[PDB]
Amino acid sequence: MDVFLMIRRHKTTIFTDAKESSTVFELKRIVEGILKRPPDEQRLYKDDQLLDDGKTLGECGFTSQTARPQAPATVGLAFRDDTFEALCIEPFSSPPELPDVMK
Amino acid sequence: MMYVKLISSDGHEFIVKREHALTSGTIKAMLSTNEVNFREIPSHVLSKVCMYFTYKVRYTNSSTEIPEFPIAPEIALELLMAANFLDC
Amino acid sequence: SMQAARLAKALRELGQTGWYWGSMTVNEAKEKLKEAPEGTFLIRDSSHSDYLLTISVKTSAGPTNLRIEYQDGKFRLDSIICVKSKLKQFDSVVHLIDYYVQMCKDKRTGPEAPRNGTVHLYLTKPLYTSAPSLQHLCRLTINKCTGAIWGLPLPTRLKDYLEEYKFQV
Ligand SMILES: CCc1cc(CNC(=O)[C@H](Cc2ccc(OP(=O)(O)O)cc2)NC(=O)Cc2ccc(F)cc2)ccc1F
Structure with a gap:
């Protein structure tokens, strides 16, 4: 059923959830409410692969087992003037080295 | 207003449901603009905090078996201080 | 008393666990453990007059229950199950649980029963309220x-x- 996701673009991350039966188009409709960019001006990716707007998240691979609230799956987001931009996701800072006591 | 934006110290923005952000007692005081700037919490810590907001809201009840919340040893010192700063 | 102070702290720690279910009947525990993996456990009040607390745990055969004893300021597993010298005593009941959990994590105890009659408690992960x-x-x-x-x-x-x-x- 429920699938939990991080929708990521550059330095922006959306925490949202959907149903495994939800479509990709339903996902872009979520993006529009929060980011005010219409669905046709959107591209969504799982890893380096573009997602067909009419598929369910399930048929894209987002299972409940793999998209948990404590470990959400990542969806990449690219925006469209005439050209669609390249998918680009800025990484989080890296953790410091573990102190010796804790190693 | 259904969502709020939380910004880490290295400039990452996290958009989460406003109801979710309220699990933090510190955030609930300020919110109860729609953005909060954490100028001492980095993104590797703040992202994990947001995952906890999700997990906490999903798993308040116990009609589902509550799974474990994995925390890498490397963030746990900083995550502790963040969790204590945000009161969650 | 230094005893009463250690028992207050024991109960304080118990409230911190997130797996103390308070007043829960044996049948509610059996229902709540029915679909859990082997070794899943919780602690709850005992419905028995002489015991404060009971461990409920999923075995391969289904949920079972093991009472915890408190005598002269120390906690141990119910002495009905084995000789007391084989039932380590603790000042706090969370520490008692931690011990048996670490025992199994450290593979010093497994889900198979011992053959020499010593204590056989297979605990893996707690059930959070x-x-x-x-x-x-x-x-x-x-x-x-x-x-x-x-x-x-x-x-x-x-x-x-x-x-x-x-x-x-
Ligand atoms: C692996 C844990 C372990 C267990 C033992 C033997 N254990 C028992 O034979 C317990 C006694 C018992 C009963 C009720 C109770 O609950 P309480 O009265 O304290 O609330 C506390 C103890 N029998 C049951 O579990 C049967 C039962 C199960 C589910 C149910 F729904 C109703 C009844 C020895 C060593 C061990 F390591």
Whole structure:
């Protein structure tokens, strides 16, 4: 059923959830409410692969087992003037080295 | 207003449901603009905090078996201080 | 009394666990454990006059129950099951649980029953009543990494927090 996701673009991350039966188009409709960019001006990716707007998240691979609230799956987001931009996701800072006591 | 934006110290923005952000007692005081700037919490810590907001809201009840919340040893010192700063 | 003070603290720690279910009947525990993996456990009040607390745990055969005894300031597993010299005593009941959990994590005990009549308690993961705080989840992780919290790069206020609950479960 429920699938939990991080929708990521550059330095922006959306925490949202959907149903495994939800479509990709339903996902872009979520993006529009929060980011005010219409669905046709959107591209969504799982890893380096573009997602067909009419598929369910399930048929894209987002299972409940793999998209948990404590470990959400990542969806990449690219925006469209005439050209669609390249998918680009800025990484989080890296953790410091573990102190010796804790190693 | 259904969502709020939380910004880490290295400039990452996290958009989460406003109801979710309220699990933090510190955030609930300020919110109860729609953005909060954490100028001492980095993104590797703040992202994990947001995952906890999700997990906490999903798993308040116990009609589902509550799974474990994995925390890498490397963030746990900083995550502790963040969790204590945000009161969650 | 120094006894009564140690028992108050024992009960304080218990409230921190997130897996203390308070007043829960044996049949509610059996229902709540029915679909859980082998070794899943919780602690709850005993419905028996002479016992404070009972462990409920999923075995391969289904949920079973094991009472905890308190006598002269110390906790141990019910002495009905084995000779008391084989049932280690503890000042806190969370520590009792932690011990048996670490025993199984360390593979010093498995789900197969021993043949020489010693204590056979297979415990893996607790059943949480609700999502614990993020602070407590971090405390659990630091406890699984080290016991030397006073040398940690942390404010004294947060070392006092870690000191209130030193267990790995
Ligand atoms: C692996 C844990 C372990 C267990 C033992 C033997 N254990 C028992 O034979 C317990 C006694 C018992 C009963 C009730 C109770 O609950 P309480 O009265 O204290 O609330 C506390 C103890 N029998 C049951 O579990 C049967 C039962 C199960 C589910 C149910 F729904 C109703 C009844 C020895 C060593 C061990 F390591």
